[PDB]
Design a protein around this ligand. Sequence first.
Ligand SMILES: CN[C@@H]1[C@@H](O)[C@@H](O[C@@H]2[C@@H](O)[C@H](O[C@H]3O[C@H]([C@@H](C)NC)CC[C@H]3N)[C@@H](N)C[C@H]2N)OC[C@]1(C)O
Ligand SMILES: Nc1nc2c(ncn2[C@@H]2O[C@H](COP(=O)(O)OP(=O)(O)O)[C@@H](O)[C@H]2O)c(=O)[nH]1
Ligand SMILES: [Cl-]
Ligand SMILES: [Mg+2]
Length: 292
Amino acid sequence: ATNVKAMKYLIEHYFDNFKVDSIEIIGSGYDSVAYLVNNEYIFKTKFSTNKKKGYAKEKAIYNFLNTNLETNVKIPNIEYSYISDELSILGYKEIKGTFLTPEIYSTMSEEEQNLLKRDIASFLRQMHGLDYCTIDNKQNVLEEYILLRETIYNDLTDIEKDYIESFMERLNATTVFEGKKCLCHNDFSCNHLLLDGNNRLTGIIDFGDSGIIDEYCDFIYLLEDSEEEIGTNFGEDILRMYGNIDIEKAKEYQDIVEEYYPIETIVYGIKNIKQEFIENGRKEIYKRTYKD
Ligand SMILES: CN[C@@H]1[C@@H](O)[C@@H](O[C@@H]2[C@@H](O)[C@H](O[C@H]3O[C@H]([C@@H](C)NC)CC[C@H]3N)[C@@H](N)C[C@H]2N)OC[C@]1(C)O
Ligand SMILES: Nc1nc2c(ncn2[C@@H]2O[C@H](COP(=O)(O)OP(=O)(O)O)[C@@H](O)[C@H]2O)c(=O)[nH]1
Ligand SMILES: [Cl-]
Ligand SMILES: [Mg+2]
């Protein structure tokens, strides 16, 4: 009840004639909280964070996409924004629908599933085809590795160090970063995909990590085999509908990103001074090392 009151205050303070009649927490990330306001608006908010210029880019991307996409699929359209080092708020009309989940997918008929895959391939084809906020993942990883070496690397165990070095060797030998670059959503998982009443794709949210990056990026979660995502076959079928893309390299890219995840988690802990993340990522290295 306290969070909500503070945020109600801040919204009314920064957005003058805006009156909050109702407000509830509708979701969060580790660094942010989203509120549903007057059963009509989403307000995404974040306080003093690592990515100081963060909601600025996300806003620029919504504006660029709302200008240049021709699609029936809805994405946030920013009506309110306040951006500062200490606090950032984006407001838009709530995109209505039901988030895609494995459970829901499994109730869909084969035809419904096909239409959804087609809708997704279609959206991605259009977004990736836009004449275009660069992101270089290889370079980012190298910089993160340098940060590790400068901070906690020497205190890690041999098993941990070997996991990291083995990954860096793979990163150095892969060719998966040498392909097409385009504007990608870059966090394209089923918890960001909204379905209408006929199980068709009706909206997509959270372009907060979006940028000009490897084309393979937008298939990483579609290809993921986990309890949260639909499955590898879902991503394969979409890749086939999308067309003109090397499927084996897309899978290599996903597999490399998945291998990086524990390390990414450690790095997040270091940068944000959150020991819990350092510990979790290290423990995940052991779990993966002993999986057979
Ligand atoms: C763009 N940043 C993404 C971040 O948003 C976050 O992405 C999540 C990603 O973390 C999540 O998958 C991770 O976590 C899954 C599980 C532990 N989630 C609770 C298992 C697979 C593992 N890759 C996906 N199912 C959904 C996806 N939106 O994690 C990876 C990342 C590179 O940091
Ligand atoms: N239905 C719906 N839920 C939304 C919308 N925007 C945000 N959410 C919810 O609140 C979260 C918003 O956080 P998000 O945009 O993904 O920013 P993040 O912190 O970068 O992950 C989502 O996971 C959804 O649960 C929207 O327009 N429609
Ligand atoms: Cl630790
Ligand atoms: Mg999100």
